[PDB]
Design an enzyme around this catalytic site. Structure first.
Site, PDB file in Angstrom:
ATOM      1  N   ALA A  22      -4.503  -1.776  10.511  1.00 47.63           N
ATOM      2  CA  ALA A  22      -4.329  -1.611  11.955  1.00 47.63           C
ATOM      3  C   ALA A  22      -4.461  -0.147  12.390  1.00 47.63           C
ATOM      4  O   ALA A  22      -4.830   0.139  13.535  1.00 47.63           O
ATOM      5  CB  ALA A  22      -2.990  -2.181  12.394  1.00 47.63           C
ATOM      6  N   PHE A  23      -4.158   0.764  11.463  1.00 48.05           N
ATOM      7  CA  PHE A  23      -4.240   2.211  11.690  1.00 48.05           C
ATOM      8  C   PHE A  23      -5.683   2.726  11.732  1.00 48.05           C
ATOM      9  O   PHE A  23      -6.004   3.634  12.502  1.00 48.05           O
ATOM     10  CB  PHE A  23      -3.462   2.958  10.595  1.00 48.05           C
ATOM     11  CG  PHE A  23      -4.062   2.813   9.218  1.00 48.05           C
ATOM     12  CD1 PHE A  23      -3.735   1.727   8.411  1.00 48.05           C
ATOM     13  CD2 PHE A  23      -4.964   3.757   8.732  1.00 48.05           C
ATOM     14  CE1 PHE A  23      -4.297   1.585   7.143  1.00 48.05           C
ATOM     15  CE2 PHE A  23      -5.534   3.621   7.471  1.00 48.05           C
ATOM     16  CZ  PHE A  23      -5.198   2.538   6.675  1.00 48.05           C
ATOM     17  N   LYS A  25      -8.919   3.254   8.536  1.00 45.77           N
ATOM     18  CA  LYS A  25      -9.511   2.994   7.219  1.00 45.77           C
ATOM     19  C   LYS A  25      -9.157   4.065   6.187  1.00 45.77           C
ATOM     20  O   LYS A  25      -8.835   5.201   6.544  1.00 45.77           O
ATOM     21  CB  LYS A  25     -11.039   2.889   7.331  1.00 45.77           C
ATOM     22  CG  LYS A  25     -11.529   1.899   8.372  1.00 45.77           C
ATOM     23  CD  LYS A  25     -12.875   2.306   8.961  1.00 45.77           C
ATOM     24  CE  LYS A  25     -12.976   1.918  10.441  1.00 45.77           C
ATOM     25  NZ  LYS A  25     -12.666   0.479  10.713  1.00 45.77           N
ATOM     26  N   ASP A 139       9.045   0.901   4.017  1.00 47.24           N
ATOM     27  CA  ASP A 139       7.914  -0.033   3.935  1.00 47.24           C
ATOM     28  C   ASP A 139       7.404  -0.275   2.518  1.00 47.24           C
ATOM     29  O   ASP A 139       6.194  -0.366   2.283  1.00 47.24           O
ATOM     30  CB  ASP A 139       6.767   0.407   4.853  1.00 47.24           C
ATOM     31  CG  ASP A 139       5.803  -0.733   5.177  1.00 47.24           C
ATOM     32  OD1 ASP A 139       6.152  -1.911   4.945  1.00 47.24           O
ATOM     33  OD2 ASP A 139       4.689  -0.457   5.666  1.00 47.24           O
TER      34      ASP A 139
HETATM   35  O1  LIG Z   1      -1.410   5.536   3.184  1.00 44.41           O
HETATM   36  C1  LIG Z   1      -1.447   6.323   2.245  1.00 44.41           C
HETATM   37  O2  LIG Z   1      -0.580   7.338   2.163  1.00 44.41           O
HETATM   38  C2  LIG Z   1      -2.498   6.145   1.172  1.00 44.41           C
HETATM   39  C3  LIG Z   1      -2.764   7.170   0.258  1.00 44.41           C
HETATM   40  C4  LIG Z   1      -3.737   7.008  -0.735  1.00 44.41           C
HETATM   41  C5  LIG Z   1      -4.484   5.817  -0.851  1.00 44.41           C
HETATM   42  C6  LIG Z   1      -4.200   4.801   0.083  1.00 44.41           C
HETATM   43  C7  LIG Z   1      -3.230   4.957   1.076  1.00 44.41           C
HETATM   44  N1  LIG Z   1      -4.857   3.626   0.064  1.00 44.41           N
HETATM   45  C8  LIG Z   1      -5.822   3.349  -0.849  1.00 44.41           C
HETATM   46  N2  LIG Z   1      -6.446   2.134  -0.825  1.00 44.41           N
HETATM   47  C9  LIG Z   1      -6.301   1.119   0.075  1.00 44.41           C
HETATM   48  C10 LIG Z   1      -6.245  -0.206  -0.397  1.00 44.41           C
HETATM   49  C11 LIG Z   1      -6.111  -1.289   0.488  1.00 44.41           C
HETATM   50  C12 LIG Z   1      -6.045  -1.060   1.871  1.00 44.41           C
HETATM   51  C13 LIG Z   1      -6.109   0.256   2.352  1.00 44.41           C
HETATM   52 CL1  LIG Z   1      -6.030   0.567   4.074  1.00 44.41          CL
HETATM   53  C14 LIG Z   1      -6.240   1.333   1.463  1.00 44.41           C
HETATM   54  C15 LIG Z   1      -6.161   4.316  -1.814  1.00 44.41           C
HETATM   55  C16 LIG Z   1      -7.161   4.047  -2.770  1.00 44.41           C
HETATM   56  C17 LIG Z   1      -7.495   5.011  -3.725  1.00 44.41           C
HETATM   57  N3  LIG Z   1      -6.846   6.196  -3.726  1.00 44.41           N
HETATM   58  C18 LIG Z   1      -5.879   6.487  -2.820  1.00 44.41           C
HETATM   59  C19 LIG Z   1      -5.492   5.565  -1.821  1.00 44.41           C
END
Ligand SMILES: O=C(O)c1ccc2c(c1)nc(Nc1cccc(Cl)c1)c1ccncc12
Length: 329
Positions: A22-23, A25, A139
């Site tokens: 929702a935020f 990507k 969360d």
């Molecule tokens: O929010 C953070 O702090 C945050 C910080 C780092 C990652 C992240 C979210 N999300 C990742 N992947 C991801 C997987 C599924 C859905 C979404 Cl939106 C994101 C991801 C992948 C690889 N390396 C670092 C990250």
């Protein structure tokens, strides 16, 4: 705005979407300014709600980097942030799959008790660090616990099944993290990992995180979400079936009157939703797949994390010193 081949701050070349929400990507980028190394970049869509929230998330991440620059306590390392034409961009270290996604890609198979013991310890340690710095994550969920490396060995069993070379984790998504001396939101946590004091709107703090960790550990153990519901009364019903009745002092305290009748949950067990709860849930101990000494220890720790009353719920100081973690030291 966001394209494969698009370049941010004259440096980061987007080459893969890693996920959406929702935020906005989270994308994988080549960092040309650091001779090619890959990073993850959270791009936040230009909604005024998400923009002001990101600037609070940024503040938390700078705090965690300041207090723990070497990620001793396994919070994700933010590398920089910048504005890209109305979109707030946060650059992170590149991590592997979420613990949720690993399960999902491994035929929804549960983690082995020994992997759970290691991960649980790292999770408890990470979040305890937050709790000693006057923060609450709010969360915690399997989606927010990510493997450092998702490298696995495939072993034929019934067919192909996966095992981690390494179980080290990081905790991500501090967008909802809240300081003690700050305005607390009424509603927190993703539904499935939400603590009863939140559902009942009795006020929450650090202990609501512990509840979420409890929910996570069970989900590791079984390979599926234990509170699969989108309804609060049903959610409360699932808790009672798994955990016993909600303490009367909490039922008395709540302003959420629609859930109860004469200080008892207003729940019909012989309804369509009642049958669903009953075939999906059962007393905690009955979930034990094996009846070992260490499984008993795990289920003892989980039970303590899933204590209804937050003032009596096990703290993470106490959790880290639990018998279940003896085999690690
Ligand atoms: O929010 C953070 O702090 C945050 C910080 C780092 C990652 C992240 C979210 N999300 C990742 N992947 C991801 C997987 C599924 C859905 C979404 Cl939106 C994101 C991801 C992948 C690889 N390396 C670092 C990250």
């Amino acid at each position: 705005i966001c394209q494969s081949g698009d370049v941010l701050r004259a440096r980061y070349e987007i080459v893969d979407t890693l996920g959406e929400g929702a935020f906005g990507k989270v994308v994988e980028c080549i960092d040309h300014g650091m001779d090619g190394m890959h990073v993850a970049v959270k791009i936040v869509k230009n909604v005024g709600r998400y923009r002001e929230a990101a600037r609070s998330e940024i503040q938390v991440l700078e705090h965690l980097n300041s207090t723990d620059p070497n990620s001793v306590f396994r919070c994700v390392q933010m590398l920089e942030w910048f504005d890209h034409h109305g979109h707030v961009c946060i650059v992170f270290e590149l991590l592997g799959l979420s613990t949720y996604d690993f399960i999902k890609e491994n035929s929804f198979l549960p983690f082995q008790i020994d992997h759970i013991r290691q991960m649980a310890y790292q999770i408890c340690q990470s979040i305890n660090f937050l709790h000693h710095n006057k923060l609450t994550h709010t969360d915690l969920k399997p989606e927010n616990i990510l493997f450092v490396k998702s490298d696995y060995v495939v072993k034929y069993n019934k067919r192909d099944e996966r095992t981690l070379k390494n179980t080290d984790i990081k905790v991500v998504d501090f967008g909802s993290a809240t300081y003690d001396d700050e305005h607390h939101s009424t509603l927190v946590s993703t539904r499935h990992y939400r603590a009863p004091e939140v559902i009942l709107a009795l006020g929450w703090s650090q202990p609501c995180d512990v509840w979420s960790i409890g929910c996570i550990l069970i989900e590791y153990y079984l390979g599926f979400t234990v509170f699969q519901t989108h309804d609060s009364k049903e959610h409360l019903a699932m808790m009672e079936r798994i955990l016993g009745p909600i303490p009367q002092h909490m039922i008395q305290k709540t302003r959420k009157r629609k859930y109860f009748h004469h200080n008892q949950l207003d729940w019909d067990e012989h309804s369509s939703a009642g049958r669903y709860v009953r075939r999906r849930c059962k007393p905690l101990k009955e979930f034990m797949l094996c009846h070992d000494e260490e499984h008993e220890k795990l289920f003892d720790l989980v039970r303590r994390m899933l204590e209804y009353d937050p003032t009596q719920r096990i703290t993470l100081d106490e959790a880290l010193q639990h018998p279940f973690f003896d085999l690690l030291k």
